[model samples]
Target chain A: NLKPQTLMVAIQCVAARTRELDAQLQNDDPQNAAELEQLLVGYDLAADDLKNAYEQALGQYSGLPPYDRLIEEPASLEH
Target chain B: NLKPQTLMVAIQCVAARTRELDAQLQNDDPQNAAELEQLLVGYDLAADDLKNAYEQALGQYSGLPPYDRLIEEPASLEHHHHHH
Candidate 1:
C-alpha cells in the first residue's frame, strides 16, 4: 500500500544546494563560497534530519516481511 | 553482485552544478551565472552520456530472470537508488 510522503525531494534540493557550495569553494571564490556555505550548512543539517526521519519511517514498517530485509544499497554506490 | 562504480555521484555532482546555476540565475546575478552556465553545459552533456552508459550496463544484465523483469519505480523515486 502507498504511504504518506516525506520530504525526500526537499532533501535532494538541499543536496543540490550543498553541491553548489562545493563548486564555489573549488575555484577559491571565497565571497560567494561564504554566502553559499551559510546556505549549505543549514541544508546539510536538514539532510541529516531528514535521513533520520526516513529511518524512523522505515522502522515503523519494519515488521513487514520484504520491507524488513531491505538493506540499503552499499554506500559505495554513492562513493 | 556489485558492479563497477560508474560516476553516478559525479553525474549528481553535475546536477548539483545545474542547481547552483539556477540559484544564481534566479538572483539575477549574471556574471556568476555565465561562468556557472559554461560549467553546467559541459556537465549536463556529461550526465547524459553517463546515463546512457548506465542503461547499457543494465542492458548487459538483461537476460537474468529477476533483472529482466524489474520495472523502474514511479518517476518520483530515483530507480537507481530508493527513498530519494
Candidate 2:
C-alpha cells in the first residue's frame, strides 16, 4: 500500500538537497565547513531513510521499478 | 562583496529540507524516526550556517534588507524603500 507519488517527491527532495550540498562543499571555506559537513551527514541519513522507505514500499507493491532505475530513467519513459 | 542570490538559494534549500523533514516526522515509525530526527538536526545546523552567511553578507552589503524581513515580506514590495 504505497503511494508512488509520495515516494517520487521524497526521492526528488533528497536528490535536490544532495546536489545543493555537493555544490556548496566544492567552494566551502573553514568558516562554515564544519556546519556544511554536518548538514551533509544529515542529508546522508535522510537519503537512507528515503531509500529504505522506497524499497519497503516496492516490496509491498509490484508496479514500481527499482529505486535507482526509477530515479535514473527519463520522465518520458514513465507510464 | 556578497552574492545575495547565493544566500537566497541557500536559505530556500534549508527551508525546503526542513519542511520535508517536518512532514516525514509526522508519519514516521520507530524504525526510521530516529534516523529522521538525526537528519533534522543536520538540517538545523545547515540552517544556522546559511543564516550566518546571510547576516554576514547583509552587513557587508547595504542594498538588501534583514534576513527575516527579506523572507517574510511580499516579493512585490521589495523595490520600495524600507528599514530593517
Candidate 3:
C-alpha cells in the first residue's frame, strides 16, 4: 500500500544526511570545499524539485527519471 | 536488533542513489559534469571508503564523521538498498 506519501517522507532521509553533512562540510572541508561541493549537489537533486517529479509521477512513476531501480534484490532481503 | 549491521548496509541506500544518478548524469549532463562533479563525490564518500569507515566504526561509530542522523523523523522509513 506504499505510495507517493512513502516517497515524500523518504526524501527526508537524504535531507537528514544533507543537514548533517552540511555542518561537517563547513567544519572539515573549510580549506577545500571540493568534497562538500560534491556532496551537497546530490542532496539538492534529491529534494530540490519534488513538485516537478511528483507531478511527473502523477502521470506514470515509471516515467520518473529512471529512478526505477528501487525494486531490485527481491523480497525477504529488502534492506 | 538494529545495530552496526544495520548501518553497515544503510551505507547501500546512499550507494543505490549514487549508482542511479551516476548513469543519469552520464546521460543527461554531458556538457557540464559539475552536477556529476558534485554528486559523484558524495557516492565516493559513502562507499569509496568502507574499510576505513568500517574499521573506524569499530572503535566508535559515533566517531564516524557525525553521520549519526538516520534515526531522525521517528523510525518509519528505510530504502531497500540490498547488498546483492
Cα lDDT tens digits for candidate 3, A1-79: 2244334333434554555556666557466667677756754654544334445566765533333333223345345
Error of 2 at B7 (Å): 25
Q: Which runs of model 1 end up more than 4 angstroms from their true locations?
A: A1-5, A62-79, B1-84
Q: Quote the RMSD, in angstroms, for model 3.
A: 19.3
User: Residue by residue across B6-50, what tens digits does model 1's lDDT show?
Assistant: 123323444555565666778854776667677666655555554
Per-residue lDDT of B1-84 in model 2, one digit per residue for the tens? 225554454465556777767777787364578888987776665556557766776555488766775444244466766788
* Number of the predicted model whose TM-score against the real structure is largest: 2
TM-score, structure 3 vs. true: 0.31
- The local lDDT score (0 to 100) that residue B52 gets in candidate 2 is 70
**Span of ten consecutive residues with least summed lDDT in model 2 chain A:** A1-10
Steric overlap count per candidate: 0, 0, 1
Point out the worst 10-residue segment of candidate 3 chain B by lDDT. Answer: B66-75
Q: List each candidate's DockQ score.
A: 0.02, 0.06, 0.03
Model 2 lDDT at residue B48: 65
lDDT of 1 by residue, A1-79 (tens): 1121312332343455455457568686677767867756655555565455556566766443332123233356469
User: Between which residue pairs do clashes occur in model 1?
Assistant: none
Give the better candidate number (1 or 2) by DockQ: 2
Fraction of native contacts under 8 Å reproduced by each candidate: 0.00, 0.07, 0.00
TM-score of 1: 0.34
